[PDB]
Each structure stands twice: as structure tokens, then as C-alpha cells.
């Protein structure tokens, strides 16, 4: 019969609530670099949640902010995925 | 190093700002759906696949029934927030 108005939305935030998100003036942001990287390699054969889970890992591991300040030195970042999807999502076939 | 917020997963019975429907005789919608999917696929599906199926089951199979024409025929959509960094299977 009916379907909720908030259904079928997926939000992929570069960072969890309350935190900063890092970006390089010459490389770009960590979340986007990672996302694009994984999408190039698996956009056509991985479920959306698998791709974002892999993007979460890449941001969490690979990167670490190098700044000359004790506060902003060697800090991390973890992306955040919010899903109201009701099906698996593949970008092909 | 590892982000202190990493590897957390939240499964809310509803999206922010809404109601969560519960039936005194059958229990809440979210829990009902979660249990039936887990007691049938908990050992063979990835956590995200499971919760996605729970999302659909709650969005479809349910529809509230009450007097007040205001709370008549209402819907619900669960919300999953994931900071996981690997796929999760409850077995092997």
C-alpha cells in the first residue's frame, strides 16, 4: 500500500557528527579522494554499502593530518554512513 | 592509529524526529522485523544486508491503526548509522 516519505535515502558524510573533516590544498579532501579511488576500482561490482565501508576503512587508516601544531597534529577521521535504503544497490546490469 | 569513533554501528528503529510504533500484543515493529530476519538469515548475511532487509520489512509490512484521524495509517522507516570499516558476519 504505502511507503514512508523518508525512505530510500542514503547519506554518506565525510565525518561523524561533531568533528572536523580534512582536505589537502594540493590533493583534495580525504573522503573524496578515497571515494573516487574505490569507485574507479569497484563502482561496477560492489554493493553501495560495501563501497562506503571500504571508504570508511581507507580514510580511517591511510591518512593522518600533518600540521605544525600539537592540537591539529597527527589527527584522524572516520566517515559516517546513514542508510534508509530498503534494497541492495548496484550501479550496473 | 585508529579513529576513536570508528567501528561503531547504530541501528535506530526510526529516523530522527519521528515516532516508533509498538503493538502491546505483538511488540514493536522494528524489533519484530529485526528478529524475524535474524532468526532466518543472521548466520549467512552481512550486517548491512540484514538491516537493509529489516528497513524494507518495516517500511512495507507495517501501517498503524488508531482512532484520532491524525495518527491514522502511519508509516515508519528505520535508520542505520555505520562507522564500520569491514564487512560483518556473525559466523565462521
Amino acid at each position: 500500500y504505502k511507503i514512508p516519505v523518508e525512505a530510500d535515502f542514503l547519506f554518506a558524510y565525510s565525518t561523524v557528527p561533531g568533528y572536523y573533516s580534512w582536505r589537502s590544498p594540493g590533493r583534495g579532501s580525504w573522503f573524496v579522494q578515497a571515494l573516487c579511488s574505490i569507485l574507479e576500482e569497484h563502482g561496477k561490482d560492489l554493493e553501495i554499502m560495501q563501497i562506503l565501508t571500504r571508504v570508511n576503512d581507507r580514510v580511517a587508516r591511510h591518512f593522518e593530518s600533518q600540521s605544525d601544531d600539537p592540537h591539529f597534529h597527527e589527527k584522524k577521521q572516520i566517515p559516517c554512513v546513514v542508510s534508509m535504503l530498503t534494497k541492495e544497490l548496484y550501479f550496473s546490469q | 592509529k585508529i579513529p576513536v569513533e570508528a567501528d561503531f554501528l547504530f541501528a535506530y528503529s526510526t529516523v530522527p524526529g519521528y515516532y516508533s510504533w509498538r503493538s502491546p500484543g505483538r511488540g514493536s515493529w522494528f524489533v519484530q522485523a529485526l528478529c524475524s530476519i535474524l532468526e532466518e538469515h543472521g548466520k549467512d548475511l552481512e550486517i548491512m544486508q540484514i538491516l537493509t532487509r529489516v528497513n524494507d520489512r518495516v517500511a512495507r509490512h507495517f501501517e498503524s491503526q488508531s482512532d484520532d484521524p491524525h495518527f491514522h495509517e502511519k508509516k515508519q522507516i528505520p535508520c542505520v548509522v555505520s562507522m564500520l570499516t569491514k564487512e560483518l558476519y556473525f559466523s565462521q
Binding site: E47, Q50, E88, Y90, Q93 | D44, E46, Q49, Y89
Partner: peptide, 5 residues
């Protein structure tokens, strides 16, 4: 494991 389309 591994998802199957």
C-alpha cells in the same frame, strides 16, 4: 563470504 547480485 561474498555478496551475489
Amino acid at each position: 563470504q561474498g555478496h551475489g547480485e
